[PDB]
Structure formats: C-alpha cells, structure tokens
Amino acid sequence: KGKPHCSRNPVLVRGIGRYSRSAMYSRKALYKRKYAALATVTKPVGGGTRVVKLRKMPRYYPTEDVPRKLLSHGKKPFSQHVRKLRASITPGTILIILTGRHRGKRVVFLKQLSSGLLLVTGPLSLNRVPLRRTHQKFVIATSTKIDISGVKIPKHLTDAYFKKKKKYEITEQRKVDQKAVDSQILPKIKAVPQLQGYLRSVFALTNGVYPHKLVF
C-alpha cells in the first residue's frame, strides 16, 4: 500500500536512466529504510454426497504431439507493438492514396488510430471518400496544413468501428458521423483559396515529371 510514484529518474536514452544506482539509492531514500525479515469440490446428490475433481482427465490421446517451444522474449503480440508515424504527417495534412481504389485522390488526414492505421477522410462533397482507414505507408504527405486543432473528433469511433465484420450497405449509424465532422472542415476548406478545387483534382504523373525531381 502507498502512493506509487513515477520513476524518480527520467529515461535519458532508451535503456538508460539519468541517475546512477548509487544516485538512485539516496533518491529512493533507502538509507533510513532498512527492511529486514482447490478443484476438488464436494456436491450433494439425492446415495450420500460426491466429490468431483474438476479439470477432469482427458479421454483421448493423439499418437504424437509437438514438444513445447523454447522461450523467446522479444516477440510480443500485435496489440502491444509501439505505433510509429512519420514526422511529416501532422494532423491537418492532406494526403494522397496510392493503392486503394481512390488512387491519387487528394484526401485529408485527421488522427492516428490504435492499431496504427490512420483516420484519413476525404470531404464527401469533394472526394467521395468516407471516414476511412489507410496505412501510413501508402500516403503522400503533402506540405499543406489546415488548422484542424479546433475540430472535435468523435470518441465513439475507433479501430473496431471500421472492421470488415462479415454485400456492404452503409448503415444508418455510419451516415451520422460523416456529416458531423464535415460541418467544421467544409467551411475550413473554403476559408482557404482554391482548396476545395484541389481536393476534387486527382494526383497523376505526366511526361517529364519525376517525383524525386520535384518536391510536394
């Protein structure tokens, strides 16, 4: 029992603290703190009473089994991997899809999800793209920002919202959320000159155009 404090020393570099173990002793104040030193269940049957032993023994055995794996440590399930993001993507940037069927459509990024997929949404008045997930790899992070730091992203939408559950029909829950976030960005993309015309246009490469030659 007690109030569990944060780490007394900060992470200086990953795997390194700012204070030595001799410096952590006096910081922890241990110099004044010498600390010295189941399944058998009986149940009545109306006879007498009987005792079942739960997790009862298996009744069939395959001829051969695989022996157990060795114990490795740096192999964690996907729900506990760290989620990275390019520094060029700041919320309010305009992206360009490359692999999804909205190829080259100019689309607006909003936020990062839990899994690592991104909440990138096109204006449905301009882009015909809903609130959609798209991985950061398939993204052209353009250097064109809009201050979406005043919009209110809905908390009820998450990674499970966009799962392919099981013919697709847009559910009546889905048509609420596309409208509710639109009511702040649709005026914001018109406070910027020639921006709603940018998003209707689709990205493409012409002759004599090289991506490494240009900046976007």
Partner: peptide
C-alpha cells in the same frame, strides 16, 4: 571479498548490510 575460498567470512557484513 569476491574470493570463494578465503573470502567466505568476508561476505558477511554485506548480507547484514542489506537488511
């Protein structure tokens, strides 16, 4: 101190230095 042969008696105050 770290001697296993002649330092048996040596590593004694430290087991009481932790308590």
């Amino acid at each position: 101190i770290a001697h296993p042969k002649l330092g048996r008696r040596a590593r004694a105050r430290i087991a009481r230095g932790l308590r």
